[PDB]
């Protein structure tokens, strides 16, 4: 949907199998349909000033580490690029 640090979201398939297991008798497959795995997003408000990121919430922590950096710069309204960028 976005990603911030991390990155985007794949597009998985499917498996409708109706069968034994291969540990009794065979096991056939009903249908493959195109699924879409959205990237478990989630939002973060942070103190750098009054900032907001949309961390892939598996990296939420990275938000802070990135906050744990006093790059020495007053207002700019966003000051995210530096953050989200002078990042790594």
């Amino acid at each position: 949907s976005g990603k911030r640090p991390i990155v985007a979201n794949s597009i998985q398939r499917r498996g409708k199998a109706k069968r034994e297991g291969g540990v009794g008798k065979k096991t056939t497959g009903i249908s493959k349909r195109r699924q879409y795995p959205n990237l478990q997003k989630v939002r973060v408000r942070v103190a750098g000033q009054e900032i907001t990121f949309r961390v892939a919430a598996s990296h939420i922590p990275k938000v802070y580490e990135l906050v744990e950096r006093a790059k020495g710069l007053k207002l700019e309204g966003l000051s995210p690029k530096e953050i989200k960028k002078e990042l790594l």
């Binding site: 939420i60 802070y64 580490e65 744990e68």
Partner: protein, 145 residues
């Protein structure tokens, strides 16, 4: 979540105490209210700093209170207090028990730290104790003339 507390808390109070909390708690209370920080090597070691640095810097007035006691313990001043038998004429205050000392040997003494309750005012052989913590009993030999 390993974090270092600042303000004293219940079940986890002693500041600088590294304690493990709920990710959430750390994130949305302790940390936001600045009651603690992320036990990150950065801060963690920087903590150790304020640890030793002061763990000895305060153990300083402890190394000198011992390299002091070994002298005022054996040394007595002896004040030339102008008096007559018992009652003195002008009680001897610490400032004198200090002045007549610093300007008699060259040693510095707090006209308050000496741990004195009253300027005496009566000749004799007085022995006391300096301050703070471990004490060093300095004595005074007030004579006449």
């Amino acid at each position: 979540m390993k974090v270092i507390l600042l303000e004293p808390l219940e079940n986890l109070g002693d500041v600088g105490q590294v304690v493990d909390v709920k990710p959430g708690y750390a994130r949305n209370y302790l940390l936001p209210r600045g009651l603690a920080v992320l036990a990150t090597e950065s801060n963690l070691k920087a903590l150790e700093a304020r640890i030793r640095a002061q763990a000895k810097r305060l153990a300083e007035r402890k190394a000198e209170a011992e390299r002091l006691k070994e002298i005022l313990e054996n040394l007595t001043l002896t004040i030339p207090v102008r008096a007559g038998e018992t009652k003195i004429y002008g009680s001897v205050t610490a400032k004198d028990i200090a002045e007549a000392l610093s300007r008699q040997h060259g040693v510095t003494i707090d006209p308050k730290r000496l741990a004195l309750e009253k300027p005496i005012k009566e000749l004799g052989e007085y022995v006391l104790t300096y301050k703070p913590h471990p004490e060093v009993p300095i004595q005074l030999k007030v004579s006449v003339v």
